Each structure stands twice: as C-alpha cells, then as structure tokens.
Amino acid sequence: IVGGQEAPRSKWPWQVSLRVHGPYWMHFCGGSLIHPQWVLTAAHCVGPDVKDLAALRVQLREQHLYYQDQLLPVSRIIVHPQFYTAQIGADIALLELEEPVKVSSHVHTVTLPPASETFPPGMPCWVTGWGDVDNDERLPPPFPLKQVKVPIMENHICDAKYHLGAYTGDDVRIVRDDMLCAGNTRRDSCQGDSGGPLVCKVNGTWLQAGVVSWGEGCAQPNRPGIYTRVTYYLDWIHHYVPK
Amino acid sequence: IVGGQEAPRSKWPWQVSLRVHGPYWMHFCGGSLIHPQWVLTAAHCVGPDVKDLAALRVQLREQHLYYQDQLLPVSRIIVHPQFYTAQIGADIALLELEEPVKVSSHVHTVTLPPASETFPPGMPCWVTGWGDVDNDERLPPPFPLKQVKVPIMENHICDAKYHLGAYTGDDVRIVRDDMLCAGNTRRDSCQGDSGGPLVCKVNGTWLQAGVVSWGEGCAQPNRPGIYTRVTYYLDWIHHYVPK
Amino acid sequence: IVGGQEAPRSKWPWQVSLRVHGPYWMHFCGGSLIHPQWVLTAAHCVGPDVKDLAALRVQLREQHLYYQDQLLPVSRIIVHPQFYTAQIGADIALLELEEPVKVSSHVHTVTLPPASETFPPGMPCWVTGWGDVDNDERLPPPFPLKQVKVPIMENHICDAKYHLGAYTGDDVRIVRDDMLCAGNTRRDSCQGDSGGPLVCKVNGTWLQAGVVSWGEGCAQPNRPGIYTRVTYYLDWIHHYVPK
Amino acid sequence: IVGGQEAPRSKWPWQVSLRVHGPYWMHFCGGSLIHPQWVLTAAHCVGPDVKDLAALRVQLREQHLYYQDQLLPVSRIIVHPQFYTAQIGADIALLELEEPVKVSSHVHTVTLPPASETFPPGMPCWVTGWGDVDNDERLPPPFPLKQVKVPIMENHICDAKYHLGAYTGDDVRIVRDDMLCAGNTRRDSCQGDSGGPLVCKVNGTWLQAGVVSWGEGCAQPNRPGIYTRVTYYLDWIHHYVPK
C-alpha cells in the first residue's frame, strides 16, 4: 500500500492473506472474505496455470502478518475461464475454504455491490493490504496491515491517462470495461496487494467495488491502479457463492 | 537461444543488437536490418511507453557482443499503434537510423516475405540472438551470437498446447492469428532474444517469418515459443519502409 | 541458530538484539545484558571502525523480532583496543545504555564467570539468537528466538580440525587462546547470532562462557564454531562495568 | 582498478587472469608470470582451504577478458604455510603451470626485486587488473585490462591511517611488516584485482613490489590499499622458483 497507514485493528474484518508453501507459508496476494466459506481474489494470483491446493493456505484478518498465524486449507480454486492475463481482463477467482469460518465482530465478510450500483467517479474508497509501500520497496517488519484512501476515477479518463506518454493508439483500449481504476501519485496499491479489496462506504454500508489487479508501477504519473470491476462479474460469482 | 550452437561469422548478416544507455551500452533486445535505414524489432522491446531516443543505440552484426562496438544512433521509434502487451498482440516496431548503413556480404538486409507466405510445418526455420541459453541462465561471456533450428507448428496446435495445464477456457484464444509459433523442449529462443529474427529459407531465399515475441518460459513442456507473424503486418511496415 | 528450537518465554532473559537504523530498525547482531546499564557483544558487530551512535539501538528480550519493539538508545560503544578482525581475536565489546533498565523475571542480567572457570568438554552449554538456521538460510518470520545445546570441545581439538583440509601449517595456531570452541554439524550458531551469548549451567547458576564470534560457515565438517572466551577479558570488562 | 585507464596492449606483458570452473571459466583473481612456468598470486585467492586443481586455469596476458581465451592447466598450488587470512599476513602463493610458456615481447615474465630493494615512499608504481572499477561496481564488458599509477606509502604511515576513525589501539599493528601499501582516494586496486602485481620502474626496470592483497573498501579515505611485500618472501619464493 502506497501513501497509507497501519489500519486500526477493528477495520477491514474481511481482509485475508494468501499463503504459498515454501521455507515458510509466505504471503503472495490478498483477498476478501465475501462469504463464511468463500474468498474473492485475483485470478493472476493463482493462475492461469493450474496450482496444487496442498500448497495453498488462507490466513484471516491479521494485524501483523506471520504473527498470529492460523492457516486455513483451501478445498477448491475457481479461476474465471476467460482469464489469461490481467491486461486482457477477467482477473477474478474464488477460493472455497474447507470449513465455514465463525464470523465475529473482528472477522466477518464484506458485502458485494448490487448489479445496478455504479461507484461514481470520486467516491471515497479504501484499499487494504500488505503489499509494498512503494515501487520495489517491501513493507517492513512487523508487517502491519496498511490502508489508504484512493479516489475512484471514470474508466474513460483512466484509459485516456494510460495513453499519455504511450505509443498505443487512442482508440485502442488499455483500461477495459470489466475493470475500474483508482488512486493517484500519492495513493495506490502495490506489489503484494493484488487480489485484495477495494471497498467503498455506500449509504452507510461497505461494498467491495474492486479487486486489486494491475497497473504500471505504483503511484506513477498518469498510471492509476486498475482493479477488476466486481459488479461486472456478479453473476459468475453467484453461480458459486450463495446469498 | 536454447539448444543451439555459436553461429558462423558468415551467417545472419541482418542480425542486430539494441543497446540502452547505462553503466555501459547494454544489450536488452534483438533486431534485424530490413533496409539501409530501418531496423525491425519487437514492440515490447521499446514500448508501450515512449522512450528517450538519445538513450538508445543500435549495433550491427557482431560475432561477440560488446567486443567490436560501433554503435549507431536512432532518429525515430515507430511502434505499432495496436500494441500494448505482447500477449495481446501487434508486438512489432520500427527503428529509423539517423544515417543509412553501407551494406556488404557481412552486413546486409533480410528479405521480408510476400503477403501470401504461410511457413507451414516442416519448413526449415532458424532463430538467432544473444539471449539466455536457458530459463534464468544468461549467455556467458564472450557472448557469442547463437542460432538454433526450430520446428514450426500450426497456430491451432500451439493454441491447444497452451491450454493444457491451465484454467483458461479452450475457446479463449491464446496464440493469436497475428502470431506464429516454433520450437520445442530442446530448441527455443529465450529472454534477451526478443525482437530478433525467425528466418526460413524458401526457394533459395531467406525470409523473415517472424519476430521473437513471448512464451511461458523457454523450451518448457506444452509451451512453444510465440513470434509475431511478419506477413500480418506488411502493410504497416510499408507505410514507413520503402519497397 | 542451526539445529535448535524456538526458546520458551521464560528462558534467556538476558538476550538482546542490536539494531541499526535504516528503512526499519534492523537486527544485525546479538548481545547480552550483564548490568542494568551495560550490554556485552562482539567487537566485530560494532567495529573496528567507529559508528554513529545515533544509528544504533538496543532491544531487550523479545519472543519474536520486530513485533514488540521498545528500542533503547546507546550512549557509549566501547570496543576492546586489541580488536581488528575476529580471526585475530579480542572479539569483545561493551554498549552503555543511556538509562538503566528495570530488571525482572522476564528480563535481567546474566552472571559473568569467575576468572578460573574453564568450561571443560562434556559440560553442556546453550547458544541463543535470531541468526540464520543454516548457511545462507534466514530465520523465517515471525522470527522466534532460538536456542540450541552445543557440545564444548578443547581448544586444541578444534585447532587441529581447522587445519584438516587446509594449507595452513599445523603449528600456525588458528583457534587462539582467548577463544572458546563449541558445536558440531547439527548444532551451531550462524550469521545473525554473532555477539550473542554462549551460556553454561555450572553450580546451579548460569554463566556466560562465550560471545558468538566466527567460524567457517555454520555446522560444517571439521569447522566447529568459535566464541570469544569471556574469562580472558574479565579484567577489561571491569574497567567499565561495576562489580 | 579504481581510477586509471585501459592499458595499451604493449604494457604489462606478465599480467595473468586466474579462472575457476563454473558455467564458464570465470575470472576470480589476478596474477603475474614471474618465471616461464610459475605464477605469483595472493594466497587468499586459492586458500586457506585446499583446492581442486582440475577446476583451476590460468589465462595469460589478454587485452579484453574472455575474448581470446587459451586456458593453461595448473599442476601445483603452493600456498605459503603461514597464511590463514589476509589481515594476519603471508598472503602469497605460487602456481606451477603444467608447461613453460614461450615468452615473447607481448607476454613474458616480470622481475622480482633484490632482497635489498626497498621502494621508497612516493615511488611511481602501477597496479593492474580486471577488478571492480569501484566499490561494488563491476568492470563492464568488453572487460579491458586496466592500469593505474599509485603512490607507495610508508608502512608506519599506512598503519597510522588505518587507525584513524577506528577503535583499534594505536600500538596494535594493522598494516604489518610483511605488507606494503599504496594508493589514495582516487587511485587504488579493487575486488577482482587481488593476486595481481604492483610494479615500479627502478633504475629503468620493472620490478614487482607487491601482490594485491586487501584493504577496507577501495580508494576510501585514510584506507590505502594493502599489498603483500614481495621482498619479504623472496626466500620462500626462491625455494620453488629457479633463480
């Protein structure tokens, strides 16, 4: 997370950490608990090539990574069939936990936005995670969960921004319709935050509007963060995740 | 180049090396001379973002990288407007030299194929360059130019292989039409070769079938190398490079 | 620490972690509290060149590094004047805190040995620290304090083994007299433990016999670990630390 | 080599490069041809631990490393028996080639100074090699042989300088008697040069005064380069190398 702060221990009860087996269960991506037994994340975190479940684990809300670990096994990895690379799109996936988690005031699901919801450009949104605090510079120990308020921006203006200083023709889409963008040169998500949540408080309830996907560097000029637009894949998520 | 041998001094007179300014003029990609004032290379080597031309230099055929440098400055970088990422396509670009090159038998241009050339499986093709000799294994000094004979396979055959061991749906095209594939588990191009030529002798004439673009790793199972198909972009090329 | 286990919270109340200022206060060496205002460590951890005291802090016993930091500033760095490299010898040093620390059951000083104590082989000792768990293998987060029981061997036994497989003449002493030797191919201290303590339980009381100094690698064949012999420098220590 | 320039191909005909077997025969140290069949070098380049001759090779005077390799096998490695580490001293070794070389104007022995020679302070001397052009800064390709003119410094003065900004007591010897020193903050030898020659023109003839040994960094203030004084070991060298 770039330009942010350690998050209060009572914020973001849905933030999750994805672990991969090695010398130790190391964090490689974020995620969000959208259902007692399901984790929403980015497909490029667990694909396009098939992964071995035995090597994956899930860690729920943690103030400092690695400290109070209680890894949870994954029963299934569901990666959107239309996904190949994040720049192309469909960068969303689901993780079915082997057991439902006992939700608490400190650890519960986040709400999915209704199919009609349209997070207006400029809405107050937050992105959370243990990703780098800047380009090429890791989050220092004890690895606190960071947060930052990033302003959402219209898809067209973002697509436009990405063409500035680029050879790509103006009518060629870079930021596509199944994506959404947010952040500026001082606030953004970064390597290690992918798969994590982009939530906005609406009416008086927190809705996940995006999933940290990709972007050129972190907090770079005319290069805001790109996220998978959740509303766009609501039907695909609901084909697996109940209500 | 994976699985080749050092190339004889009399072969590949069109091979070039692109250098970027730094502690020394380092080789980052390959290229080919298609005209006394033009070089053809991969769009991802010099884009999608605009670069400082002054920081770029071109080196004509050399038996050993850095050994006998006579760097040539560049006046224009022309990247196919449809390009953004190699996996999406249009991974092609043009470099105009500030001065025309004097051709000879050791240094001359390569012949581009006729718009109808197909390069079917069983055609004799070679790929050259100063890239890695294997995944994460750089070409050791004195850095000789290497060459390797690569088997060409039909696009749909490679497309099917890229779907093996992956979540991407079978009907979701991976190896695209403006692409060409070649190589196997013992013969392939690798990192550092991008932008270089893939030439096949057709009726006593060498033709550049493709430009080294991308692949999942190098010489990996079910992951043949992918090259941008030159015949697909002849019209574009000719909008800049005279006949 | 190679070949050990996580130490229980009630053990090694004198262990300390030295921290150098940087993106975060990083651990570079161990140490021991021998007085409410003094810390004993290796001279190679802070010299032979003078350091900027401001960039150095001390962390008292922690079950896990970086998680419960309560860094303490240093006012003096006193390195034995005989020191230059660890191999030569006199690898001992003192740190004076700016304020005395409040002692308790979880954190108090270690008892220095009487001048006549030899710590003969057989007699079991332990070495503790947050160093690598093997050659080139870092202690994984959450970075627990480790401990390991190491067999003490006579100085001449170790000296003889250090000459095995070496060109150094047998009569050119390697393991010097102001040094002490312990550990084997399965139990040893490693990079990151230098400066820490080697303690042996004598008459129901724990005594610091050595200070983690050097060795050729960690837990390697015929290369037991080498520690500064604390009894050799008692007089020097008392020239600064009260009795 | 810090400071200095690429050497004319007619200079330093006795300089050699030591190669160790890996992905390619890589340069790890410099050396000098002092006899048709012998190479003088630094003990730490090939010790203290015993080495496998099969994995070692010698490359004679080359203008650009790796480009015109003609590796010569080594039959014997004689490391001075009093050597253990560069700081302690006796950092000198001998390499017996398996075949005498056919000396020429381009490649021939350097001459050893007479046991009486002293090389006064402020003497014009040159050190050469393919080592780093600066602290942590590799000599870039095409790897030209470099040279620099460095001023000899009186031993006492060097020892004195090494005590400035250090905790080592003033009467504790750092730069020992079997050592010699030269260089300043602009000119010095560096990592990659160790084992190389330090020659001075005396009475109109080139004599090797030292072997590149150690130093605190390269060209650092009050930290001149330390070399193994050759005159000091003439007797040891002549026990093997014919007069």
Ligand SMILES: *[C@](=O)([C]([C][C][C]1[C][C][N][C]1)[N]C(=O)O[C][C]=[C])C1=NOC([C]C2=[C][C]=C(C(=O)[N][C]3[C]C4=[C][C]=[C][C]=C4[C]3)[C]=[C]2)=N1
């Ligand atoms: C993320 O941090 C994002 C960055 C998001 C933008 C940066 C600034 N604005 C927002 N990802 C990123 O995708 O950028 C480029 C690609 C389109 C991130 N960090 O790392 C990645 C990529 C990645 C690294 C490592 C893994 C991994 O370990 N994967 C697998 C999963 C698995 C399960 C079981 C057993 C083994 C494995 C290995 C995955 C993805 N993106």
Ligand SMILES: *[C@](=O)([C]([C][C][C]1[C][C][N][C]1)[N]C(=O)O[C][C]=[C])C1=NOC([C]C2=[C][C]=C(C(=O)[N][C]3[C]C4=[C][C]=[C][C]=C4[C]3)[C]=[C]2)=N1
């Ligand atoms: C390439 O080596 C290729 C190899 C292609 C396949 C591998 C096996 N079968 C064939 N491919 C590759 O796709 O890399 C990954 C991304 C899609 C290659 N090497 O490096 C790249 C990418 C790349 C890295 C760094 C640079 C660079 O330095 N660029 C610029 C050029 C420039 C000019 C002036 C001033 C500054 C710069 C920076 C370029 C490309 N691909």
Ligand SMILES: *[C@](=O)([C]([C][C][C]1[C][C][N][C]1)[N]C(=O)O[C][C]=[C])C1=NOC([C]C2=[C][C]=C(C(=O)[N][C]3[C]C4=[C][C]=[C][C]=C4[C]3)[C]=[C]2)=N1
């Ligand atoms: C040690 O781990 C020891 C381990 C000892 C043996 C290995 C197996 N058996 C036991 N050994 C070691 O030999 O080190 C090298 C040579 C004598 C160790 N850890 O780290 C070091 C070396 C070292 C690294 C980094 C620093 C450092 O950062 N120092 C200073 C302190 C400081 C304070 C304030 C401002 C700046 C600084 C920089 C020091 C030493 N050895």
Ligand SMILES: *[C@](=O)([C]([C][C][C]1[C][C][N][C]1)[N]C(=O)O[C][C]=[C])C1=NOC([C]C2=[C][C]=C(C(=O)[N][C]3[C]C4=[C][C]=[C][C]=C4[C]3)[C]=[C]2)=N1
């Ligand atoms: C040297 O460059 C010296 C530098 C000289 C000073 C700099 C300014 N004043 C002079 N540096 C140095 O640090 O000296 C040693 C003591 C602290 C140098 N280059 O590399 C080294 C150390 C070194 C690196 C790599 C090897 C190596 O690979 N050795 C062997 C030889 C061998 C043969 C067969 C099979 C295996 C091997 C491994 C050795 C030494 N110092």
